[PDB]
Design a protein around this ligand. Structure first.
Ligand SMILES: *[C@@H]1O[C@H](CO[C@@H]2O[C@@H](C)[C@@H](O)[C@@H](O)[C@@H]2O)[C@@H](O[C@@H]2O[C@H](CO)[C@@H](O[C@@H]3O[C@H](CO)[C@@H](O)[C@H](O[C@H]4O[C@H](CO)[C@@H](O)[C@H](O)[C@@H]4O)[C@@H]3O)[C@H](O)[C@H]2NC(C)=O)[C@H](O[C@@H]2O[C@@H](C)[C@@H](O)[C@@H](O)[C@@H]2O)[C@H]1NC(C)=O
Ligand SMILES: *[C@@H]1O[C@H](CO[C@@H]2O[C@@H](C)[C@@H](O)[C@@H](O)[C@@H]2O)[C@@H](O[C@@H]2O[C@H](CO)[C@@H](O[C@@H]3O[C@H](CO)[C@@H](O)[C@H](O[C@H]4O[C@H](CO)[C@@H](O)[C@H](O)[C@@H]4O)[C@@H]3O)[C@H](O)[C@H]2NC(C)=O)[C@H](O[C@@H]2O[C@@H](C)[C@@H](O)[C@@H](O)[C@@H]2O)[C@H]1NC(C)=O
Ligand SMILES: *[C@@H]1O[C@H](CO[C@@H]2O[C@@H](C)[C@@H](O)[C@@H](O)[C@@H]2O)[C@@H](O[C@@H]2O[C@H](CO)[C@@H](O)[C@H](O)[C@H]2NC(C)=O)[C@H](O[C@@H]2O[C@@H](C)[C@@H](O)[C@@H](O)[C@@H]2O)[C@H]1NC(C)=O
Lengths: 104, 109
């Protein structure tokens, strides 16, 4: 089983209102599997792989390499506070959550 | 007509019961979808299942079909098991998100 696995916990983020935030999901052996992002308290899907799903215009994604998958939140507001889940479509699914703190 | 944001058919059943070993069908009807997508998500672990007719999960029992005549996005859980019981959400990718939650019971008899 050369299955995907998380390399380390998603770091939490503390960011002042109006500045930009980045969450990074660090994985190994991703292979053909795909990284999804969702907001844990609203359950809103943010992105899968290179495709943003939410119509929140402040949300983008990127990857530095196959091991390093980013969710970007521009110009953060108070409503962005809460958990952001990185998810892998393994069977069974694997997930980790990092938390956004918005300071005024 | 005038551009509208999407909305759910609020008469769709929200409590569904289906048989072990048979397909379970969870229905969601979205009007005026426009450029949004309709996703199905499993509440117990927040696992994304389908976005439109794309299947994200690699549990190959899940498949979402679009029935254009009734604007319905129907999640099929093939060969459903008791562990599949629980709440699933149909989700429109507006900001904020719009959700229609459907409970699924899986029984033998
Ligand atoms: C990112 O932050 C997470 C928490 O964020 C806060 O909480 C959430 C809900 C939200 O409100 C945020 O805004 C907050 O900032 C971290 O996860 C937490 O980690 C701690 C561990 O440091 C967990 O704690 C445990 O809680 C248990 C009950 O809930 C206790 O039983 C347990 O006590 C036992 O163990 C400790 C040793 O850890 C002993 O000292 C005790 O005596 C006792 O034996 C802990 O106190 C907490 O539950 C976690 N919260 C959640 C929601 O998971 C997260 O830390 C990462 O995740 C956890 C699971 C561990 O793997 C950490 O090692 C890991 O780093 C932060 N992430 C990072 C990268 O720091
Ligand atoms: C229906 O949705 C289409 C898809 O939306 C995108 O994808 C979905 C999944 C979701 O992620 C949405 O949030 C996305 O926007 C719309 O087409 C896209 O429109 C956006 C703009 O709304 C386009 O984007 C911009 O493209 C510019 C270059 O052409 C960039 O300069 C720009 O960057 C700036 O803007 C963003 C704000 O979004 C800031 O955050 C940045 O900081 C930066 O300042 C964006 O990249 C995107 O290119 C479009 N997609 C495609 C495939 O063309 C569609 O929007 C309609 O059509 C587009 C072409 C525009 O004319 C819109 O004004 C127009 O409404 C939606 N349709 C309707 C009717 O709403
Ligand atoms: C949601 O549906 C559950 C089961 O399906 C229903 O039962 C069939 C007889 C039929 O009505 C079908 O159309 C329905 O979809 C209900 O749970 C069942 O409740 C019966 C008693 O009514 C009980 O004997 C069963 O054990 C139980 N089945 C399961 C799998 O739990 C739900 O009812 C709620 O939950 C029950 C446990 C009970 O507390 C009841 O009073 C509750 O209303 C249905 N939920 C709702 C909100 O309607």
């Amino acid at each position: 089983a050369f299955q995907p696995e998380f390399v380390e916990s998603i770091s939490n983020v503390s960011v002042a209102v109006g500045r930009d935030a980045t969450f990074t999901c660090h994985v190994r052996h991703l292979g053909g599997y795909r990284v999804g992002w969702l907001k844990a308290d609203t359950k809103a899907i943010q992105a899968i792989h290179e495709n943003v799903i939410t119509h929140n215009p402040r949300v983008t994604v990127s990857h530095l390499d196959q091991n390093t998958w980013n969710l970007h939140i521009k110009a953060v507001s108070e409503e962005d506070r809460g958990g952001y889940m990185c998810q892998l479509n393994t069977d069974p699914m694997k997930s980790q959550i990092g938390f956004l703190d918005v300071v005024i | 007509g005038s551009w509208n944001e999407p909305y759910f058919d609020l008469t769709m059943p929200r409590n569904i019961t289906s048989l072990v070993g048979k397909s379970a069908y969870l229905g969601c009807r979205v009007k005026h979808l426009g450029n949004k997508t309709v996703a199905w998500i499993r509440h117990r672990d927040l696992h994304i299942l389908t976005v439109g007719t794309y299947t994200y999960t690699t549990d190959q029992r899940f498949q979402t079909s679009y029935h254009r005549d009734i604007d319905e996005w129907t999640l099929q859980i093939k060969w459903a098991q008791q562990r599949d019981a629980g709440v699933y959400e149909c989700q429109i990718s507006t900001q904020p998100v719009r959700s229609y939650s459907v409970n699924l019971n899986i029984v033998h008899h």
